[PDB]
Design a protein around this motif. Sequence first.
Motif, PDB file in Angstrom:
ATOM      1  N   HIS A   1     -40.147  41.967 -29.050  1.00  0.00           N
ATOM      2  CA  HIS A   1     -38.788  42.028 -28.496  1.00  0.00           C
ATOM      3  C   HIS A   1     -38.450  43.521 -28.560  1.00  0.00           C
ATOM      4  CE1 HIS A   1     -37.613  37.838 -27.956  1.00  0.00           C
ATOM      5  NE2 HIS A   1     -37.805  37.525 -29.228  1.00  0.00           N
TER       6      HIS A   1
ATOM      7  N   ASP B   1     -30.378  47.971 -18.881  1.00  0.00           N
ATOM      8  CA  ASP B   1     -31.846  47.999 -18.968  1.00  0.00           C
ATOM      9  C   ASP B   1     -32.547  48.424 -17.694  1.00  0.00           C
ATOM     10  OD1 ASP B   1     -31.020  45.508 -17.808  1.00  0.00           O
ATOM     11  OD2 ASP B   1     -32.948  44.635 -18.355  1.00  0.00           O
ATOM     12  N   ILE B   2     -31.789  48.743 -16.661  1.00  0.00           N
ATOM     13  CA  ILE B   2     -32.337  49.308 -15.422  1.00  0.00           C
ATOM     14  C   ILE B   2     -32.032  50.824 -15.296  1.00  0.00           C
ATOM     15  CG2 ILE B   2     -31.632  49.216 -12.984  1.00  0.00           C
ATOM     16  CD1 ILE B   2     -31.864  46.066 -13.462  1.00  0.00           C
ATOM     17  N   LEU B   3     -31.225  51.345 -16.211  1.00  0.00           N
ATOM     18  CA  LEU B   3     -30.908  52.791 -16.299  1.00  0.00           C
ATOM     19  C   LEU B   3     -32.048  53.622 -16.865  1.00  0.00           C
ATOM     20  CD1 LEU B   3     -27.286  53.137 -17.770  1.00  0.00           C
ATOM     21  CD2 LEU B   3     -28.043  53.771 -15.393  1.00  0.00           C
TER      22      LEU B   3
ATOM     23  N   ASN C   1     -34.144  40.161  -7.121  1.00  0.00           N
ATOM     24  CA  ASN C   1     -33.881  41.573  -6.871  1.00  0.00           C
ATOM     25  C   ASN C   1     -33.527  42.309  -8.163  1.00  0.00           C
ATOM     26  OD1 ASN C   1     -31.520  43.798  -5.860  1.00  0.00           O
ATOM     27  ND2 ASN C   1     -33.403  43.757  -4.658  1.00  0.00           N
ATOM     28  N   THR C   2     -32.913  41.621  -9.126  1.00  0.00           N
ATOM     29  CA  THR C   2     -32.600  42.271 -10.392  1.00  0.00           C
ATOM     30  C   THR C   2     -33.816  42.321 -11.333  1.00  0.00           C
ATOM     31  OG1 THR C   2     -30.218  41.838 -10.319  1.00  0.00           O
ATOM     32  CG2 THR C   2     -31.205  42.093 -12.535  1.00  0.00           C
TER      33      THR C   2
ATOM     34  N   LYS D   1     -36.465  45.131 -11.095  1.00  0.00           N
ATOM     35  CA  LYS D   1     -36.070  46.414 -11.687  1.00  0.00           C
ATOM     36  C   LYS D   1     -36.122  46.407 -13.226  1.00  0.00           C
ATOM     37  CE  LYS D   1     -32.924  47.337  -7.773  1.00  0.00           C
ATOM     38  NZ  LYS D   1     -31.512  46.903  -7.490  1.00  0.00           N
ATOM     39  N   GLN D   2     -35.781  45.257 -13.825  1.00  0.00           N
ATOM     40  CA  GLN D   2     -35.741  45.117 -15.290  1.00  0.00           C
ATOM     41  C   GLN D   2     -37.150  45.070 -15.866  1.00  0.00           C
ATOM     42  OE1 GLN D   2     -33.342  41.502 -15.281  1.00  0.00           O
ATOM     43  NE2 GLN D   2     -31.641  42.613 -16.284  1.00  0.00           N
TER      44      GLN D   2
ATOM     45  N   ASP E   1     -36.344  45.250 -27.129  1.00  0.00           N
ATOM     46  CA  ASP E   1     -34.917  45.559 -27.144  1.00  0.00           C
ATOM     47  C   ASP E   1     -34.261  45.458 -28.514  1.00  0.00           C
ATOM     48  OD1 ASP E   1     -35.139  42.679 -26.978  1.00  0.00           O
ATOM     49  OD2 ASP E   1     -33.111  42.594 -26.090  1.00  0.00           O
ATOM     50  N   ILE E   2     -35.041  45.082 -29.525  1.00  0.00           N
ATOM     51  CA  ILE E   2     -34.592  45.071 -30.914  1.00  0.00           C
ATOM     52  C   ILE E   2     -35.164  46.258 -31.733  1.00  0.00           C
ATOM     53  CG2 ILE E   2     -35.154  43.707 -32.945  1.00  0.00           C
ATOM     54  CD1 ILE E   2     -34.490  41.239 -31.087  1.00  0.00           C
ATOM     55  N   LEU E   3     -36.066  47.035 -31.134  1.00  0.00           N
ATOM     56  CA  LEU E   3     -36.710  48.168 -31.818  1.00  0.00           C
ATOM     57  C   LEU E   3     -35.742  49.325 -31.849  1.00  0.00           C
ATOM     58  CD1 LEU E   3     -40.442  48.739 -30.619  1.00  0.00           C
ATOM     59  CD2 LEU E   3     -39.665  48.157 -32.957  1.00  0.00           C
TER      60      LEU E   3
ATOM     61  N   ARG F   1     -39.245  38.917 -23.020  1.00  0.00           N
ATOM     62  CA  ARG F   1     -38.032  39.380 -22.397  1.00  0.00           C
ATOM     63  C   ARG F   1     -37.181  38.252 -21.766  1.00  0.00           C
ATOM     64  NH1 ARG F   1     -34.112  40.089 -20.187  1.00  0.00           N
ATOM     65  NH2 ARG F   1     -33.277  41.928 -19.100  1.00  0.00           N
TER      66      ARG F   1
ATOM     67  N   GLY G   1     -38.622  49.110 -14.439  1.00  0.00           N
ATOM     68  CA  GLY G   1     -37.880  50.335 -14.678  1.00  0.00           C
ATOM     69  C   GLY G   1     -37.151  50.413 -15.995  1.00  0.00           C
ATOM     70  N   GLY G   2     -36.047  51.151 -15.971  1.00  0.00           N
ATOM     71  CA  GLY G   2     -35.230  51.387 -17.146  1.00  0.00           C
ATOM     72  C   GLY G   2     -35.975  52.208 -18.174  1.00  0.00           C
ATOM     73  N   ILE G   3     -35.503  52.146 -19.408  1.00  0.00           N
ATOM     74  CA  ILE G   3     -36.129  52.883 -20.487  1.00  0.00           C
ATOM     75  C   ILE G   3     -37.416  52.199 -20.962  1.00  0.00           C
ATOM     76  CG2 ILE G   3     -35.947  53.513 -22.864  1.00  0.00           C
ATOM     77  CD1 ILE G   3     -34.425  55.371 -21.390  1.00  0.00           C
ATOM     78  N   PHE G   4     -37.463  50.863 -20.891  1.00  0.00           N
ATOM     79  CA  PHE G   4     -38.603  50.137 -21.458  1.00  0.00           C
ATOM     80  C   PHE G   4     -39.839  50.178 -20.579  1.00  0.00           C
ATOM     81  CE2 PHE G   4     -35.212  47.332 -23.611  1.00  0.00           C
ATOM     82  CZ  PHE G   4     -35.151  48.139 -24.716  1.00  0.00           C
TER      83      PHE G   4
ATOM     84  N   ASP H   1     -36.096  52.338 -32.777  1.00  0.00           N
ATOM     85  CA  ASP H   1     -36.709  53.630 -32.442  1.00  0.00           C
ATOM     86  C   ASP H   1     -37.821  53.451 -31.375  1.00  0.00           C
ATOM     87  OD1 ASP H   1     -38.251  52.249 -34.245  1.00  0.00           O
ATOM     88  OD2 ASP H   1     -38.736  53.891 -35.541  1.00  0.00           O
ATOM     89  N   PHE H   2     -37.564  52.583 -30.407  1.00  0.00           N
ATOM     90  CA  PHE H   2     -38.465  52.464 -29.255  1.00  0.00           C
ATOM     91  C   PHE H   2     -38.698  53.811 -28.566  1.00  0.00           C
ATOM     92  CE2 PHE H   2     -39.043  52.449 -24.711  1.00  0.00           C
ATOM     93  CZ  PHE H   2     -40.123  51.641 -24.543  1.00  0.00           C
TER      94      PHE H   2
END
Lengths: 258, 258
Positions: free
Chosen positions: A62, B64-66, A99-100, A103-104, A64-66, A92, A107-110, A68-69
């Motif tokens: 997961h 999460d798409i930023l 369409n969303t 991108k998730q 999105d729980i880290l 996830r 992309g994004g930070i992950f 210091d990812f």
Amino acid sequence: AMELSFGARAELPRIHPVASKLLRLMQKKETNLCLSADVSLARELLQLADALGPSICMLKTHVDILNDFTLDVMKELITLAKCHEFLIFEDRKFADIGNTVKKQYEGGIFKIASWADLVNAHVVPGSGVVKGLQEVGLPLHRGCLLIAEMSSTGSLATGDYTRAAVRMAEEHSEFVVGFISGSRVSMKPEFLHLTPGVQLEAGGDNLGQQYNSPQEVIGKRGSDIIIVGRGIISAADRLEAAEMYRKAAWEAYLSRLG
Amino acid sequence: AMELSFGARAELPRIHPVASKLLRLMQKKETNLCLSADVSLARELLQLADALGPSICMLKTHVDILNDFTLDVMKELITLAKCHEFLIFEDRKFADIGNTVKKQYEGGIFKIASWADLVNAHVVPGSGVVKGLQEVGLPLHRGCLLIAEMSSTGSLATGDYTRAAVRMAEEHSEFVVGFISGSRVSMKPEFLHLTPGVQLEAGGDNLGQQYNSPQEVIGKRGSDIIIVGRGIISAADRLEAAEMYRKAAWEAYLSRLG
Ligand SMILES: O=c1ccn([C@@H]2O[C@H](COP(=O)(O)O)[C@@H](O)[C@H]2O)c(=O)[nH]1
Ligand SMILES: O=c1ccn([C@@H]2O[C@H](COP(=O)(O)O)[C@@H](O)[C@H]2O)c(=O)[nH]1
């Protein structure tokens, strides 16, 4: 159907290369244990991945729980996955329109698609959710798991919801490799079944989680892989706990094979 | 039965503070438009929020798409939200067991609960999803929306699933302030209804999105707020487009008020 071994299924004709890669290492290493690495520190994630790597077929994250990812953490995790031979499953639970979710995933930070062998999706939005993930995942030889059932009390993933999940898998078998389920939901041997809500002691937590034993889930209910978080993570010695769960899940699989 | 204004609804004895704050600013600014700010850059996010703040009651994010998310960006967004007067809604769609979603909401890189007035949750895991989020949201004076229906083709959020969503919301009214839905699904005026899949013209996208008009969704189907992304963002003149949507949604609301 009669019971095929992980090795036989790895060799099947319609099998996704990801599922094949998974089924081979399972056979090779005698493990159908997926570690649910529910930790908030990269150092802990990485130390668990390295120590327990030999005992597991798969590490579930997961991200999105880290706390210091970074993508460098994921680089080091990939190196451990290659070294010890396990797949990375990012849990996830994509659950939005196509369409969303594309991108998730990309992309994004992950940048999940760049490091995760597998991801999962809820089927509640209709098949658009899988179509969006596919556009990104197919060329990357990734796979996807559909959530056909959940382990928690009050779960609505039942009845026709579960049947819709299996249909959707069948309709997108170029990208969907199996299920998150509490039991076998499809007879097609090319589909993987992964089951969370597993501890040695049947029981639950304070927020609706339910537990069943490896013997029940793999042996009786015919699932392929156990997903275990707290049953391992909370132990003093996570290696010993992982080994306990591995032998239990494996011996349970051998039993039903006959 | 008899429709109350947004201003009167904001004063209902059982109204949730976050819902009350939103209903107040909707009446003040004459806007029941929520901007779906589906962009990949902080700068675009902040630019749109500033430019269109006056026209909207709410800005809906997918953080999460930023590509360049940081908490400083969110600090800035909040300044804009406080200056132009709109709420921030992070469309995270929490959909895991209670133990997991609380960490996903409070923790990780995004720290969603530290800046989002509202979040949403899928109901498929059972009410444990809300109970987990509440542990984090209530101390931070936040609210939550339950996804009772979806806009996309093949959505399974129908019939009894939808009714389960409404029950769950009623039973957690300290935290749950309403619904993502395509129509009114509760008769209790304390609950908000927010509807995505909205455009002035008929149609959809190539991945299962379906569009209905503001007059249809607010006027005939009795929802409160329209959520609009591409209908605004893809237009040449986003200020004009936002105003068209605001005026459409607002007049539809007035008509139903009689
Ligand atoms: O139906 C599901 C789907 C996913 N998970 C995930 O599997 C792990 C279970 O951990 P534990 O309850 O074994 O600690 C958690 O990461 C949780 O998010 C479930 O528990 N049940
Ligand atoms: O049932 C739903 C729930 C959420 N969204 C979200 O609302 C926005 C719709 O954008 P657009 O189709 O207006 O561009 C997107 O951010 C999407 O994730 C839907 O479209 N439908």
